[PDB]
Amino acid sequence: TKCTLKSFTVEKGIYQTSNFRVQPTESIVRFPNITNLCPFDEVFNATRF
Amino acid sequence: DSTECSNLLLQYGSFCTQLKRALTGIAVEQDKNTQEVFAQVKQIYKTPPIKYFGGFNFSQILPDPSKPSKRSPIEDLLFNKVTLFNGLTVLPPLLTDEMIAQYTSALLAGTITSGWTFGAGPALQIPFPMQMAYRFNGIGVTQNVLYENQKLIANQFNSAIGKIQDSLSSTP
Amino acid sequence: FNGLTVLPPLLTDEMIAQYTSALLAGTITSGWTFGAGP
Amino acid sequence: LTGTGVLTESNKKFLPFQQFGRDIADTTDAVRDPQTLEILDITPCSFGGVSVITPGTNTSNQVAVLYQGVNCTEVNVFQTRAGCLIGAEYVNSSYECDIPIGAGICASYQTQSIIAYTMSLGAENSVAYSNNSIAIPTNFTISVTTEILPVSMTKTSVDCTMYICG
Amino acid sequence: LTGTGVLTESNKKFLPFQQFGRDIADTTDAVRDPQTLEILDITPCSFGGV
Amino acid sequence: SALGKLQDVVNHNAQALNTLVKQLSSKFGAISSVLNDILSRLDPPEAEVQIDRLITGRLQSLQTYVTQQLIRAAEIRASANLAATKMSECVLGQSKRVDFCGKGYHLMSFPQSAPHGVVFLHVTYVPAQEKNFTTAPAICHDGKAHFP
Amino acid sequence: QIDRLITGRLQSLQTYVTQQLIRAAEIRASANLAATKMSECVLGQSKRVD
Amino acid sequence: AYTNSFTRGVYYPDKVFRSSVLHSTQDLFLPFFSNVTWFHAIHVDNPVLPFNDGVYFASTEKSNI
């Protein structure tokens, strides 16, 4: 508070020095989800070349 | 919360200091306005329990012990008739609604039991019909005119106070 | 300064104090009357 | 959809083709899970201003701190309608207020501690009304009151080009 | 240090490691000579409206 | 803090000028705040657009200052009108307006000069030492009513 | 590319504060009138017409 | 033939939920009270119609024709 008033003697009262804001503690992502994959499997294991 | 913007904003100067100063000045001013208007009386004057004042019926304006908020019925009508982030905050007022209602009740009790006197110094009690005789005399009508029509005058005052609430409610 | 200025006032403090003393002498010796005429 | 916030179990009936919820002014209020397709509520995590309550440098260095728009569950300690105040204890006595905190709460130096308390609007005077009684003054006192008022301010003139670039 | 103004004999006690003097609001008010180490006061010469 | 208002006027004016002088140092996005360097270490074609920022920024600062001064001048004019009304009505006469010229029944008032305003010494009459009495609205004598 | 946003948003916030100063002056005039009406009409009887 | 389409053809434009609020959007809608072309499904088979910007195709039938 002294530093915000730029004065070594601060009088009786209420002074707004700064503000606070809670930072996030963790990060979560949830993205594109599919059930069925591609048919590469058959293609390669079809044993019919 | 971008670091680069603070890094670029520090070179623009003290605009934020000016903005904070201007807005706090406005807020403190709002508080002073409410004080200046309502907090004129120094002592909270109470209403006597036997509420008989010579036929006049102040029930519509005196505080209601029934409701928990302790507001008179007209005040209740007014409060119900009117109703109503990114770094923006609304600060609360210093005097809550309850304390303003208490100040208003003090002014009413003072004016009802003591007339003009409570504004010039110590409240001196005076019967309500004699107070209204004083005021009649004040507008150039002799006071006998009030004592001979006390009944009629009380009836007209009651009727007008009754129509006020209906008018506030019917006006859109 | 840097293009700033502080033009002086027109009535100096002495002339204002003289006006105030005029009002005091008038009100002390003549009451309301000095405001309505002679 | 990228954002920050606290997620809370939702209470809104999303229709099956909807993926977002917004209040007025495009504030994203709700979201559907890309896995379980369940709706979640978004609230911006807590922020607010902090103020310092001080009884004067010349009385003592003790100080109390007021976090304005926040609840202490996520900051002696005290909760008020204006926020949580730390360093001052709440007392039941009502006094004439000197440090206004807000919402009817004030603070002052006890004398050895800083106490927060509810405001008092003055003493109660139950004037004795009666239908036939009068109170009349028998003496007087003439007083003098001083009232101050500003009348004018400093006249300033500015030179454009000099101020711009010398 | 580049500037314009009238130079006058100083009355200020510069400490031996200091080279410039400034008043409130960054107006460079004084300077010590790099040759004779004498302190000098700077005042912008007169200007005004007509 | 009896003279809070006059002192407050003075400090606001001083603070406004101080910030106006201080805003000359900001770069506003330009490569430097002093005009000499900007015009020295860059060619004229680019120095034009690098000097534009300082010009526009300082012009905006000056514009803000003038607007703020217009608002404060309106406030002081309201106060000066009130002072003139108080002079006319309380000093040059006697006012029945309640609690205008001080708390209590007004007798007279005296003006005193101050550096940027006036100081009125309102003289008021205040009752004291009250007493209880019983009263009646009229007296009946000879069958007819008397009023005071 | 970020300078533009900063300067533009700063201008927006400045207009908001100026509009608020004018509105606060308006409300202050009204509040002074309300205090006058309290003192003169409630705490006494006024001969001022209308 | 011709027939005015009453207040029909509006659709959810953004798959974004909004509750108890009014919203104004500029998009390709069917102007109210405009007349719309009418064709019949008995036989002749079907003429080509241009796809200017978007088509509002309404049909009341009960035989999957």
Q: How many helices and strands in chain H, by DSSP H and E?
A: 0, 3
The residue whose two tokens read 């004999």 is: E9
Chain E residues whose beta carbon lies within 8 Å of the beta carbon of residue F36: 2
Question: Closest by alpha carbon to B69, among B116, B37, B101, B30?
Answer: B101
The residue whose two tokens read 């009629």 is: B152
Instruction: Measure the CA angle with vertex A7, ends A5 and A12; round to 5°.
Output: 75
CB contact under 8 A, F117 and D148: yes
Chains that touch D (3 or more CB pairs under 8 A): A, B, C, E, F, H
Contact status of B127 with chain D (Cβ, < 8 Å): yes
Residues F96, B88 contacting (CB under 8 angstroms):
no
> Within 13 Å and on the Cβ side, how many CA atoms surround F42?
16
Q: In three state form, how does the secondary structure of F43-112 look?
A: CHHHHHHHHHHHHHHHHHHHHHHHHHHHHHHHHHHHHHHHHHHHHHHHHCCCCCCCCCCCCCEEEEEEEE
Q: Can you give the C-alpha Rg of chain G in angstroms?
A: 21
Q: Can you give the C-alpha Rg of chain E in angstroms?
A: 12
Chain F residues whose beta carbon lies within 8 Å of the beta carbon of residue C30: none
Tell me which residue in B26, B40, B116 faces G38 most closely, judged by beta carbons.
B40
Give the phi and the psi of residue A16 in degrees, each rounded to 5.
-90, 100
Q: Smallest CA–CA separation between F97 and chain E, in Å?
A: 48
Nearest CA in chain C to D166: C2
Q: Smallest CA–CA separation between C24 and chain D, in Å?
A: 16
The residue whose two tokens read 């008179």 is: B72
Q: How many Cβ atoms are within 10 Å of D82's Cβ, its own excluded? A: 19
Chain F residues whose beta carbon lies within 8 Å of the beta carbon of residue B122: 127-128, 130
State the Cα–Cα distance between residues F18 and B92, nearest whole angstrom: 32
Give the phi and the psi of residue H10 in degrees, each rounded to 5.
-75, 145
Label residue D114 exposed, middle or buried (CB < 10 Å: 0-12, 13-18, 19+): buried
| At least 3 CB pairs under 8 A between chains E and H | no
DSSP state, B143? T
Question: Closest by alpha carbon to F89, among F59, F111, F68?
Answer: F111
The residue whose two tokens read 């009002």 is: C23
Chain breaks in chain B (C to N over 2.5 A) after: 84
> Within 13 Å and on the Cβ side, how many CA atoms surround F119?
14
The residue whose two tokens read 């009502």 is: D94
Chain F residues whose beta carbon lies within 8 Å of the beta carbon of residue E24: 18
CB contact under 8 A, C17 and F113: yes
First and final CA of chain A: distance in angstroms? 81
Which H/E stretch holds residue B4? helix B3-9
What does the block give as tokens for B163? 């129509």
Q: How many Cβ atoms are within 10 Å of D152's Cβ, its own excluded? A: 17
- What is the residue type of F121? L
Specify the experimental method.
Answer: cryo-EM
Q: Smallest CA–CA separation between B102 and chain A, in Å?
A: 26
- What is the residue type of B7? N
Chains that touch B (3 or more CB pairs under 8 A): A, D, F, G
Q: In three state form, how does the secondary structure of chain D look?
A: CCCCCEEEECCCCCCCCCCEEECHHHCEEEEECCCCCCEEEEECCCEEEEEEEECCCCCCCCCEEEECCCCHHHCCEEEECCEEEECCEECCCCECCCEEEECCEEEEECCCCEEEEEECCCCEECCCCCCCEEEEEEEEEEEEEEEEEECCCCCCCCCHHHHHHC
Residues F116, F103 contacting (CB under 8 angstroms):
no
What does the block give as tokens for F77? 């004019």
CB contact under 8 A, A16 and B20: yes
Chains that touch E (3 or more CB pairs under 8 A): C, D, F
Buried b (16+ CB within 10 A) or exposed e, F130-141: beeeeeebeeee
Tell me which residue in D12, D20, D24 faces H16 most closely, judged by beta carbons.
D20
Label residue F57 exposed, middle or buried (CB < 10 Å: 0-12, 13-18, 19+): buried
Residues D149, F82 contacting (CB under 8 angstroms):
yes
Torsion of CA A9, A12, A16, A20, to 10 degrees: 90
> Within 13 Å and on the Cβ side, how many CA atoms surround B86?
6
CB contact under 8 A, F58 and D137: no
3-class DSSP state of A15: strand
The full DSSP string for G2-36 is HHHHHHHHHHHHHHHHHHHHHHHHHHHHHHHHHHH
Residues D36, D63 contacting (CB under 8 angstroms):
no
What does the block give as tokens for D1? 């959809």
Contacts of B77 (CB under 8 A, 6+ apart): B165, B168, B169
Give the phi and the psi of residue F125 in degrees, each rounded to 5.
-105, 125
CB contact under 8 A, B11 and F98: no
- What is the residue type of D20? F
Residues D88, D115 contacting (CB under 8 angstroms):
yes
Contact status of H16 with chain D (Cβ, < 8 Å): yes
What does the block give as tokens for D132? 């036939």
Contacts of D125 (CB under 8 A, 6+ apart): B43, B44, B45, B46, B123
Strand partners, D80: D83
Question: Closest by alpha carbon to D66, among D58, F19, D81?
Answer: D81
Residues D134, B124 contacting (CB under 8 angstroms):
yes
Contacts of F87 (CB under 8 A, 6+ apart): C23, F111, F118
Which residue, among F17, F19, F21, would best test binding to E if mutated, counting the most E CBs under 10 Å from its CB? F21
Residues D117, D123 contacting (CB under 8 angstroms):
no
DSSP state, A29? -
Residues B45, D125 contacting (CB under 8 angstroms):
yes
Question: Closest by alpha carbon to C19, among F84, F66, D62?
Answer: F84
Which H/E stretch holds residue B135? helix B128-138
Chain D residues whose beta carbon lies within 8 Å of the beta carbon of residue C11: none
CB contact under 8 A, A9 and D55: no
Contact status of C7 with chain D (Cβ, < 8 Å): yes
CB contact under 8 A, F137 and B133: yes
State the Cα–Cα distance between residues E23 and C2, nearest whole angstrom: 14
What does the block give as tokens for F64? 């803000």
CB contact under 8 A, D56 and A11: yes
CB contact under 8 A, C5 and E44: no
Resolution in Å, one decimal place: 3.4
Which H/E stretch holds residue B17? helix B15-38
Alpha-carbon distances of H54 from H9, H28, H58, H63, rounded to whole Å: 11, 8, 13, 26
Alpha-carbon distances of D54 from D51, D70, D84, E26, rounded to whole Å: 10, 21, 16, 32
Which residue, among D2, D40, D51, D110, would best test binding to A if mutated, counting the most A CBs under 10 Å from its CB? D51
Question: Closest by alpha carbon to H5, among H48, H46, H50, H36?
Answer: H36
Question: Closest by alpha carbon to B43, among B106, B94, B95?
Answer: B106
Give the phi and the psi of residue A32 in degrees, each rounded to 5.
-20, 110
Label residue A2 exposed, middle or buried (CB < 10 Å: 0-12, 13-18, 19+): middle
CB contact under 8 A, C20 and F113: yes
Strand partners, C15: none
Tell me which residue in C1, C2, C5 faces E49 most closely, judged by beta carbons.
C5
Residue positions counted in chain F: 148
State the Cα–Cα distance between residues B40 and G41, nearest whole angstrom: 13
What does the block give as tokens for D162? 């000099």
Which residue, among D42, D57, D63, D86, would best test binding to A if mutated, counting the most A CBs under 10 Å from its CB? D57
CB contact under 8 A, B48 and D128: yes
Buried b (16+ CB within 10 A) or exposed e, C1-38: eebeeeeeeeeeeeebeeebeebeeebeeeeeeebeee
What does the block give as tokens for C29? 């010796």
Alpha-carbon distances of F39 from D20, F44, F51, rounded to whole Å: 54, 7, 8
Question: Closest by alpha carbon to B144, among F141, F145, D131, D132?
Answer: F145
Nearest CA in chain C to F20: C4
Torsion of CA B66, B70, B72, B74, to 10 degrees: -110
Dihedral sign for Cα D9, D10, D16, D18, please: negative
Nearest CA in chain G to F65: G18
Contact status of C5 with chain E (Cβ, < 8 Å): yes
Q: How many Cβ atoms are within 10 Å of D155's Cβ, its own excluded? A: 11
State the Cα–Cα distance between residues D103 and B32, nearest whole angstrom: 15
Chain H residues whose beta carbon lies within 8 Å of the beta carbon of residue D18: 15-17
DSSP state, B47? P
Tell me which residue in B13, B124, B133 faces F23 most closely, judged by beta carbons.
B13
For helices F44-86 and G2-37, give the axis angle rounded to 10 degrees: 0
3-class DSSP state of F146: strand
The full DSSP string for C1-38 is --S---PPPSS-HHHHHHHHHHHHHHHHHHTTGGGT--
Dihedral sign for Cα H6, H8, H13, H18, please: positive
Residues F37, F68 contacting (CB under 8 angstroms):
no
Contact status of A18 with chain B (Cβ, < 8 Å): no
Contacts of D58 (CB under 8 A, 6+ apart): A9
Tell me which residue in B44, B89, B125 faces D128 most closely, judged by beta carbons.
B125
CB contact under 8 A, A21 and D59: no
Residues D152, F80 contacting (CB under 8 angstroms):
yes
What does the block give as tokens for G4? 């533009």
- Per DSSP bridges, beta strands D124-125 and B44-45 are parallel
Give the phi and the psi of residue B146 in degrees, each rounded to 5.
-80, -40
State the Cα–Cα distance between residues E42 and B88, nearest whole angstrom: 47
Residues F122, D144 contacting (CB under 8 angstroms):
yes
Nearest CA in chain E to D157: E49
CB contact under 8 A, D14 and H17: yes
What does the block give as tokens for F18? 């101080």
State the Cα–Cα distance between residues B1 and D3, nearest whole angstrom: 12
DSSP state, B53? B
Question: Closest by alpha carbon to D84, among D63, D96, D69, D98?
Answer: D69
Torsion of CA C27, C29, C32, C35, to 10 degrees: -70
State the Cα–Cα distance between residues A46 and B125, nearest whole angstrom: 110
The residue whose two tokens read 């027939």 is: H3
Chain B residues whose beta carbon lies within 8 Å of the beta carbon of residue A21: 1
Nearest CA in chain F to E26: F22
First and final CA of chain B: distance in angstroms? 46
Region of residue B30 (phi > 0: left; psi between -120 and 50: alpha; otherwise: beta)? alpha
State the Cα–Cα distance between residues B52 and B50, nearest whole angstrom: 6
Tell me which residue in C2, C5, C9 faces D156 most closely, judged by beta carbons.
C5
